[PDB]
Design a protein around this ligand. Structure first.
Ligand code: CA
Length: 223
């Protein structure tokens, strides 16, 4: 997150870190045994880390649970990042309390103007590299489809939306990928892509989760 703030320990209780020896992507806990992330975060050997604040220090609220199965969206295209979503099942159910909690799936899509909370352990600099140890947060609005398409001609599909600030300075970034965009208490987006980070007229591009609720539900029901 560039131009955000320190969230506060365990204030984003559905935020997970995906670890393969090191943090490499975010995710969102959507029930005791399943995480939603970005398909471009796919790899084998994932451990899901819940209850994290400082990802480099054991602080006492962590749960570390191996993935038993990963499911990349059937129509994921890695060249265009269309359908940039994947589900991860935990080998065991997480214990849910105030500091580790699921986030509700949307029943309807969000619209431009709605403010949302974006969170992660990604890069904090736009022209530089600094990775935080504690979870960072950014409040940002959803942008219009037309401004989104204007920023990124020929690249925005119906499974993507833009959020952030066209003036630059505030954005998600590398290492935030896969993590949440929560608006009015619903998971509306997944950190997916962007040209650099926090660049003028290059807002963040997010997977449009409301389009995938049917797929998420049926996948969970059968796996
Ligand atoms: Ca920790």
């Amino acid at each position: 997150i560039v131009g955000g703030y320190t969230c506060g320990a365990n204030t984003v209780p559905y935020q997970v870190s995906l670890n393969s020896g090191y943090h490499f992507c975010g995710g969102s806990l959507i029930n005791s045994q399943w995480v939603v992330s970005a398909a471009h975060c796919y790899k084998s050997g994932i451990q899901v880390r819940l209850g994290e604040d400082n990802i480099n220090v054991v602080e006492g609220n962590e749960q570390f649970i191996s993935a038993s199965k990963s499911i990349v969206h059937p129509s994921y295209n890695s060249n265009t990042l269309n359908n940039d979503i994947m589900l991860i099942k935990l080998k065991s159910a997480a214990s849910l309390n105030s500091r580790v909690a699921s986030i509700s799936l949307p029943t309807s899509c969000a619209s431009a103007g709605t403010q949302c909370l974006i969170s992660g352990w990604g890069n904090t600099k736009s022209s530089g590299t600094s990775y935080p140890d504690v979870l960072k947060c950014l409040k940002a609005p959803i942008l219009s489809d037309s401004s989104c398409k204007s920023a990124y001609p020929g690249q925005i599909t119906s499974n993507m939306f833009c959020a952030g600030y066209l003036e630059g300075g505030k954005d998600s970034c590398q290492g935030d990928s896969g993590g949440p965009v929560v608006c009015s208490g619903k998971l509306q987006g997944i950190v997916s892509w962007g040209s650099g980070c926090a660049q003028k007229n290059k807002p963040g591009v997010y997977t449009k989760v409301c389009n995938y609720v049917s797929w998420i539900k049926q996948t969970i029901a059968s796996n």
